[PDB]
Every structure is written in structure tokens, then in C-alpha cells.
mmCIF file of all heavy atoms in Angstrom:
data_model
loop_
_atom_site.group_PDB
_atom_site.id
_atom_site.type_symbol
_atom_site.label_atom_id
_atom_site.label_comp_id
_atom_site.label_asym_id
_atom_site.label_seq_id
_atom_site.Cartn_x
_atom_site.Cartn_y
_atom_site.Cartn_z
ATOM 1 N N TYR A 10 -15.763 -52.329 11.370
ATOM 2 C CA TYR A 10 -14.887 -52.808 10.325
ATOM 3 C C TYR A 10 -15.519 -52.973 8.963
ATOM 4 O O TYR A 10 -14.942 -52.615 7.934
ATOM 5 C CB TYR A 10 -14.147 -54.068 10.776
ATOM 6 N N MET A 11 -16.770 -53.468 8.905
ATOM 7 C CA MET A 11 -17.539 -53.487 7.662
ATOM 8 C C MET A 11 -17.793 -52.082 7.109
ATOM 9 O O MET A 11 -17.586 -51.840 5.913
ATOM 10 C CB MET A 11 -18.910 -54.163 7.892
ATOM 11 N N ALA A 12 -18.210 -51.126 7.946
ATOM 12 C CA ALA A 12 -18.480 -49.755 7.574
ATOM 13 C C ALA A 12 -17.250 -49.022 7.035
ATOM 14 O O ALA A 12 -17.338 -48.279 6.065
ATOM 15 C CB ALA A 12 -19.039 -48.989 8.789
ATOM 16 N N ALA A 13 -16.086 -49.271 7.640
ATOM 17 C CA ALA A 13 -14.812 -48.739 7.184
ATOM 18 C C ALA A 13 -14.462 -49.177 5.782
ATOM 19 O O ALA A 13 -14.075 -48.362 4.938
ATOM 20 C CB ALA A 13 -13.682 -49.178 8.144
ATOM 21 N N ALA A 14 -14.660 -50.477 5.439
ATOM 22 C CA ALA A 14 -14.463 -51.002 4.112
ATOM 23 C C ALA A 14 -15.381 -50.379 3.067
ATOM 24 O O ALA A 14 -14.961 -49.966 2.001
ATOM 25 C CB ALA A 14 -14.687 -52.536 4.147
ATOM 26 N N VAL A 15 -16.689 -50.249 3.422
ATOM 27 C CA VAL A 15 -17.729 -49.668 2.565
ATOM 28 C C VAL A 15 -17.459 -48.227 2.198
ATOM 29 O O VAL A 15 -17.446 -47.869 1.033
ATOM 30 C CB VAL A 15 -19.103 -49.745 3.268
ATOM 31 N N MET A 16 -17.190 -47.376 3.218
ATOM 32 C CA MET A 16 -16.980 -45.960 2.990
ATOM 33 C C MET A 16 -15.634 -45.629 2.381
ATOM 34 O O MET A 16 -15.520 -44.663 1.620
ATOM 35 C CB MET A 16 -17.209 -45.115 4.271
ATOM 36 N N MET A 17 -14.598 -46.420 2.665
ATOM 37 C CA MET A 17 -13.281 -46.189 2.115
ATOM 38 C C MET A 17 -13.179 -46.451 0.621
ATOM 39 O O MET A 17 -12.686 -45.622 -0.144
ATOM 40 C CB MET A 17 -12.277 -47.123 2.839
ATOM 41 N N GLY A 18 -13.658 -47.616 0.160
ATOM 42 C CA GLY A 18 -13.330 -48.069 -1.190
ATOM 43 C C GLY A 18 -14.207 -47.533 -2.290
ATOM 44 O O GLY A 18 -13.719 -47.003 -3.285
ATOM 45 N N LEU A 19 -15.532 -47.663 -2.140
ATOM 46 C CA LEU A 19 -16.479 -47.363 -3.201
ATOM 47 C C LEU A 19 -16.552 -45.907 -3.594
ATOM 48 O O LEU A 19 -16.586 -45.566 -4.774
ATOM 49 C CB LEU A 19 -17.900 -47.873 -2.833
ATOM 50 N N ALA A 20 -16.558 -44.968 -2.620
ATOM 51 C CA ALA A 20 -16.596 -43.529 -2.898
ATOM 52 C C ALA A 20 -15.311 -43.016 -3.557
ATOM 53 O O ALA A 20 -15.354 -42.157 -4.433
ATOM 54 C CB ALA A 20 -16.923 -42.750 -1.617
ATOM 55 N N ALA A 21 -14.133 -43.575 -3.180
ATOM 56 C CA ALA A 21 -12.844 -43.174 -3.707
ATOM 57 C C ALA A 21 -12.646 -43.483 -5.190
ATOM 58 O O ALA A 21 -11.828 -42.857 -5.861
ATOM 59 C CB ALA A 21 -11.730 -43.831 -2.869
ATOM 60 N N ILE A 22 -13.458 -44.401 -5.754
ATOM 61 C CA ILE A 22 -13.558 -44.666 -7.194
ATOM 62 C C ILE A 22 -13.900 -43.405 -7.972
ATOM 63 O O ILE A 22 -13.401 -43.173 -9.060
ATOM 64 C CB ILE A 22 -14.545 -45.803 -7.503
ATOM 65 N N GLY A 23 -14.738 -42.516 -7.382
ATOM 66 C CA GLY A 23 -15.149 -41.286 -8.062
ATOM 67 C C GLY A 23 -14.031 -40.328 -8.365
ATOM 68 O O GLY A 23 -13.984 -39.745 -9.446
ATOM 69 N N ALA A 24 -13.056 -40.158 -7.475
ATOM 70 C CA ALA A 24 -11.867 -39.412 -7.840
ATOM 71 C C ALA A 24 -10.852 -40.123 -8.641
ATOM 72 O O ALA A 24 -10.159 -39.498 -9.432
ATOM 73 C CB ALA A 24 -11.051 -39.031 -6.636
ATOM 74 N N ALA A 25 -10.734 -41.445 -8.468
ATOM 75 C CA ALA A 25 -9.844 -42.236 -9.292
ATOM 76 C C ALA A 25 -10.153 -42.008 -10.764
ATOM 77 O O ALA A 25 -9.285 -41.729 -11.584
ATOM 78 C CB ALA A 25 -10.026 -43.724 -8.916
ATOM 79 N N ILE A 26 -11.464 -41.998 -11.081
ATOM 80 C CA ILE A 26 -11.971 -41.585 -12.371
ATOM 81 C C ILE A 26 -11.871 -40.078 -12.622
ATOM 82 O O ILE A 26 -11.385 -39.648 -13.673
ATOM 83 C CB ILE A 26 -13.408 -42.075 -12.545
ATOM 84 N N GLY A 27 -12.270 -39.230 -11.651
ATOM 85 C CA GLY A 27 -12.346 -37.806 -11.862
ATOM 86 C C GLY A 27 -11.027 -37.107 -12.032
ATOM 87 O O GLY A 27 -10.897 -36.244 -12.886
ATOM 88 N N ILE A 28 -9.978 -37.481 -11.276
ATOM 89 C CA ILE A 28 -8.599 -36.985 -11.429
ATOM 90 C C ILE A 28 -8.070 -37.289 -12.822
ATOM 91 O O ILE A 28 -7.454 -36.457 -13.495
ATOM 92 C CB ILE A 28 -7.674 -37.554 -10.360
ATOM 93 N N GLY A 29 -8.355 -38.520 -13.318
ATOM 94 C CA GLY A 29 -8.003 -38.930 -14.661
ATOM 95 C C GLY A 29 -8.719 -38.192 -15.770
ATOM 96 O O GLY A 29 -8.103 -37.851 -16.786
ATOM 97 N N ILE A 30 -10.012 -37.866 -15.591
ATOM 98 C CA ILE A 30 -10.805 -37.088 -16.538
ATOM 99 C C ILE A 30 -10.219 -35.723 -16.771
ATOM 100 O O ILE A 30 -10.142 -35.204 -17.890
ATOM 101 C CB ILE A 30 -12.282 -36.960 -16.087
ATOM 102 N N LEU A 31 -9.767 -35.099 -15.697
ATOM 103 C CA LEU A 31 -9.125 -33.826 -15.777
ATOM 104 C C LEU A 31 -7.805 -33.785 -16.450
ATOM 105 O O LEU A 31 -7.516 -32.872 -17.234
ATOM 106 C CB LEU A 31 -8.939 -33.444 -14.341
ATOM 107 N N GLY A 32 -6.962 -34.789 -16.166
ATOM 108 C CA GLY A 32 -5.663 -34.873 -16.813
ATOM 109 C C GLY A 32 -5.774 -35.223 -18.252
ATOM 110 O O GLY A 32 -4.960 -34.779 -19.061
ATOM 111 N N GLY A 33 -6.822 -35.977 -18.635
ATOM 112 C CA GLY A 33 -7.086 -36.252 -20.034
ATOM 113 C C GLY A 33 -7.490 -35.000 -20.790
ATOM 114 O O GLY A 33 -7.027 -34.772 -21.905
ATOM 115 N N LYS A 34 -8.289 -34.119 -20.158
ATOM 116 C CA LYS A 34 -8.625 -32.823 -20.706
ATOM 117 C C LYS A 34 -7.438 -31.889 -20.850
ATOM 118 O O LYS A 34 -7.297 -31.187 -21.844
ATOM 119 C CB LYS A 34 -9.727 -32.100 -19.891
ATOM 120 N N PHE A 35 -6.531 -31.875 -19.847
ATOM 121 C CA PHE A 35 -5.290 -31.121 -19.910
ATOM 122 C C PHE A 35 -4.392 -31.577 -21.066
ATOM 123 O O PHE A 35 -3.912 -30.760 -21.848
ATOM 124 C CB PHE A 35 -4.532 -31.285 -18.551
ATOM 125 N N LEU A 36 -4.198 -32.902 -21.212
ATOM 126 C CA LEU A 36 -3.387 -33.458 -22.295
ATOM 127 C C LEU A 36 -3.969 -33.197 -23.665
ATOM 128 O O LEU A 36 -3.252 -32.759 -24.586
ATOM 129 C CB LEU A 36 -3.233 -34.993 -22.118
ATOM 130 N N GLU A 37 -5.295 -33.403 -23.859
ATOM 131 C CA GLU A 37 -5.966 -33.120 -25.115
ATOM 132 C C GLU A 37 -5.993 -31.632 -25.457
ATOM 133 O O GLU A 37 -5.775 -31.247 -26.617
ATOM 134 C CB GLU A 37 -7.368 -33.765 -25.177
ATOM 135 N N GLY A 38 -6.227 -30.736 -24.465
ATOM 136 C CA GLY A 38 -6.202 -29.294 -24.673
ATOM 137 C C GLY A 38 -4.859 -28.752 -25.067
ATOM 138 O O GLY A 38 -4.734 -27.945 -25.987
ATOM 139 N N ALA A 39 -3.770 -29.202 -24.400
ATOM 140 C CA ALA A 39 -2.420 -28.860 -24.748
ATOM 141 C C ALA A 39 -1.952 -29.429 -26.084
ATOM 142 O O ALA A 39 -1.225 -28.783 -26.827
ATOM 143 C CB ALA A 39 -1.446 -29.272 -23.623
ATOM 144 N N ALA A 40 -2.365 -30.660 -26.450
ATOM 145 C CA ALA A 40 -2.078 -31.228 -27.763
ATOM 146 C C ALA A 40 -2.715 -30.456 -28.917
ATOM 147 O O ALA A 40 -2.109 -30.210 -29.953
ATOM 148 C CB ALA A 40 -2.550 -32.693 -27.828
ATOM 149 N N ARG A 41 -3.974 -30.006 -28.737
ATOM 150 C CA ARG A 41 -4.666 -29.179 -29.696
ATOM 151 C C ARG A 41 -4.122 -27.754 -29.809
ATOM 152 O O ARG A 41 -4.109 -27.189 -30.902
ATOM 153 C CB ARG A 41 -6.189 -29.136 -29.417
ATOM 154 N N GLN A 42 -3.718 -27.145 -28.684
ATOM 155 C CA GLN A 42 -3.219 -25.787 -28.665
ATOM 156 C C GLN A 42 -2.060 -25.631 -27.657
ATOM 157 O O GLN A 42 -2.294 -25.240 -26.511
ATOM 158 C CB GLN A 42 -4.363 -24.805 -28.251
ATOM 159 N N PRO A 43 -0.797 -25.924 -28.025
ATOM 160 C CA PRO A 43 0.351 -25.920 -27.118
ATOM 161 C C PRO A 43 0.622 -24.620 -26.393
ATOM 162 O O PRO A 43 1.160 -24.643 -25.289
ATOM 163 C CB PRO A 43 1.536 -26.313 -28.017
ATOM 164 N N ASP A 44 0.278 -23.457 -26.974
ATOM 165 C CA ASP A 44 0.497 -22.166 -26.373
ATOM 166 C C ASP A 44 -0.366 -21.919 -25.127
ATOM 167 O O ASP A 44 -0.088 -21.055 -24.305
ATOM 168 C CB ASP A 44 0.229 -21.061 -27.424
ATOM 169 N N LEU A 45 -1.441 -22.716 -24.913
ATOM 170 C CA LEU A 45 -2.342 -22.533 -23.796
ATOM 171 C C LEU A 45 -1.901 -23.310 -22.558
ATOM 172 O O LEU A 45 -2.570 -23.237 -21.521
ATOM 173 C CB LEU A 45 -3.772 -23.003 -24.145
ATOM 174 N N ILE A 46 -0.761 -24.026 -22.593
ATOM 175 C CA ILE A 46 -0.218 -24.791 -21.448
ATOM 176 C C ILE A 46 -0.133 -24.034 -20.117
ATOM 177 O O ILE A 46 -0.648 -24.563 -19.125
ATOM 178 C CB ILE A 46 1.127 -25.440 -21.783
ATOM 179 N N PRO A 47 0.440 -22.837 -19.995
ATOM 180 C CA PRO A 47 0.594 -22.200 -18.685
ATOM 181 C C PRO A 47 -0.737 -21.663 -18.180
ATOM 182 O O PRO A 47 -0.841 -21.440 -16.979
ATOM 183 C CB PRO A 47 1.649 -21.119 -18.884
ATOM 184 N N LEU A 48 -1.730 -21.444 -19.056
ATOM 185 C CA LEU A 48 -3.053 -21.036 -18.660
ATOM 186 C C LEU A 48 -3.870 -22.178 -18.054
ATOM 187 O O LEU A 48 -4.533 -22.024 -17.051
ATOM 188 C CB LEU A 48 -3.854 -20.425 -19.840
ATOM 189 N N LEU A 49 -3.833 -23.378 -18.672
ATOM 190 C CA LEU A 49 -4.709 -24.462 -18.245
ATOM 191 C C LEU A 49 -4.098 -25.425 -17.232
ATOM 192 O O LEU A 49 -4.794 -26.204 -16.578
ATOM 193 C CB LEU A 49 -5.194 -25.323 -19.453
#
């Protein structure tokens, strides 16, 4: 039960951040150049 808590929560922070980093790049890239939306 301790091991389940350790492995579940702390590592999943990396995608919580990483999924957001990507969507921020998508939003900023499309704001700068709207025609590149279907490519990115």
C-alpha cells in the first residue's frame, strides 16, 4: 500500500506538466501563425 502511493502519485506529475507544456506550445504556435493549425 505504501509502494502503490509512491509510484502512482509522484511520477504522474511529469505528464501533468508535460501534457500542459505541449498544449501551451500548440496554443502559442497557432496564435503566432493561424494557417499552421492543421499541421501542428
